[PDB]
Structure formats: C-alpha cells, structure tokens
C-alpha cells in the first residue's frame, strides 16, 4: 500500500538511472547462451519493462553488473539496446521456484 510504495517505486527509478548510465560504458565480457528465456511479470525485475530475451545459442555483450540477480548488457542484433540479463545464479533461482 502507501507504506510499500515509498521504497518500491524509488528503486525502479534508481535502477533505471543505472540502466541509462551503462549504455555508454565499454563492453566488459560477452557470454554464449545455452537455453532459452523470456521476461515474466514475477521475475523480480528491477525496472518492469526493460528486460531482454534470449533463445538457445544467443550472444549477450554484458556491460556491467547491476546486482547479484541481474546483469546489464545488450543483444548482438541490429538496433537492439541494453537490457536486464539474468545471472546464472538467477537462472539457478528461477528453476528451483518452479518445483517449490
């Protein structure tokens, strides 16, 4: 409610400012994906709407590391911008919640 919206909405804009301030940062390390993933509404996404999706065997030029559950980086594709890359421990967290 009103006491829950004071801290949850001030985290979305603070993670959006970190997302805007990482597009000009140089590319640190790129990864090769093995499985497929698309963003969902319950994935604890920091800025709801700006997450990216990858299928099996895609490439992700990761710019920086936002937290322990989301990376910041872009898709290797014409016109694609930065986005929220799920970490391998976030990909470890998402499958075990499908069982519990």
């Amino acid at each position: 409610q009103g006491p829950h919206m004071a801290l949850r909405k001030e985290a979305e804009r603070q993670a959006l400012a970190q997302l805007e301030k990482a597009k000009t940062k140089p590319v640190a390390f790129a990864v090769r994906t093995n499985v497929g993933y698309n963003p969902s509404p319950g994935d604890e996404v920091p800025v709801e709407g700006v997450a990216i999706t990858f299928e099996p065997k895609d490439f992700l030029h990761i710019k920086e590391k936002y937290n322990n559950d989301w990376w910041i980086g872009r898709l290797v594709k014409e016109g694609c911008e930065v986005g929220f890359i799920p970490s391998p421990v976030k990909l470890d967290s998402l499958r075990l919640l499908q069982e519990q």
């Binding site: 990864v31 090769r32 499985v35 014409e78 391998p88």
Partner: protein, 178 residues
C-alpha cells in the same frame, strides 16, 4: 551444465575447409581473401597469423592459451579480429573452446573443378590428389547451416560482396548507435 560461457566480445573471423589446408591449392585460395579484408576494413580490424593448434584446450597448454588470451585482448578495444589458422578443417574442430569464431565456409560448388585446380599446380600437388578430396567431401558432408558465411561465387567481386556486407551487418549488430 553451465548456461553461460566466457566468449570474446568480438568474434574472430576465420575461414576453413574449402580444401584441406597445408597445400598450394587451399591456402592460395584463402590468401586472396585475406587481402580484400585488409584494406576494405583498414583501421577497424586485427588480422593475425596463427601458428599453434587452438583445438587442444603438439603444442602444450600454455603456448595455446597465451594465444587464446591474445584473442581475448583483441576483443577489448571493440574491433574485428581475423585469424590465419592453418590446421582448421572442420566445424566441430573449434567447438570445444571458449572463442566461438566466425565460420566463413568457402564453398567450391563443383568437386570436379578442384582436381582440375590440382593439375594446374604442377606435379607437386598432383601427388596429393585424393587426400584433399577427403575433407573437401567431409566439409561438404557437414550441414551448411552449422557454418556462418558461405561463399559459392567464382568471381572475386561476388564472393567479396558477401564477405564485406555480412560483417558490416554484423558490425552494426554488435555496435549500437548513440
């Protein structure tokens, strides 16, 4: 099973398997292609000459990995990387490391023309007739969708219209506008 693998930020460009390398036929076919990409993308490419077999991670581990980490250095400044690798003759030959290079596959559209190119190289390559056609067949046995860039064009400009435009479509994929 790890889902993410540490690959370079700019993939190294490499072409192999048209004819088995280590011959006057296949290498002089590729040496014309290294000349085109040297001056067309001059200032935004890093072209090297590869010596040690990088399909091993013969040479030890240290002499190969110090050359693999040199490819890791050539991806830091966000420019194109090109490899003159002399023993690469298979798609899955470079499937086990953490590089994932660009598989430009030179396609000889007719197998009979290769042994006519063999008899054009004198009698030095005429002693090596059927041994080249083995991996010329085996690369033709590999599926073309497993590769990256296919060149079936006899003339210079038509193999080079694909060789420039595909990586120019790949450069704009890696690099976003401001």
């Amino acid at each position: 099973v790890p889902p993410y693998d540490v690959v370079p930020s700019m993939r190294p460009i490499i072409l192999v398997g048209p004819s088995l390398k280590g011959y006057e036929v296949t290498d002089m076919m590729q040496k014309a292609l290294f000349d085109f990409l040297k001056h067309l993308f001059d200032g935004r490419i890093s072209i090297t000459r590869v010596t040690a077999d990088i399909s091993l991670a013969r040479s030890s581990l240290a002499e190969v990995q110090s050359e693999i980490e040199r490819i890791f250095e050539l991806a830091r400044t966000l420019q194109l990387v090109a490899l003159d690798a002399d023993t690469i003759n298979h798609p899955a030959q470079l499937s086990k490391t953490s590089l994932a290079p660009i598989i430009v596959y030179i396609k000889i559209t007719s197998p009979k023309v290769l042994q006519r190119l063999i008899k054009s190289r004198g009698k030095s390559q005429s002693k090596h007739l059927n041994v080249q056609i083995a991996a010329s067949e085996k690369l033709a046995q590999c599926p073309p969708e497993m590769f990256d860039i296919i060149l079936d064009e006899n003339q210079l400009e038509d193999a080079c219209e694909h060789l420039a435009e595909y990586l120019e479509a790949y450069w704009k994929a890696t690099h976003p506008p401001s």
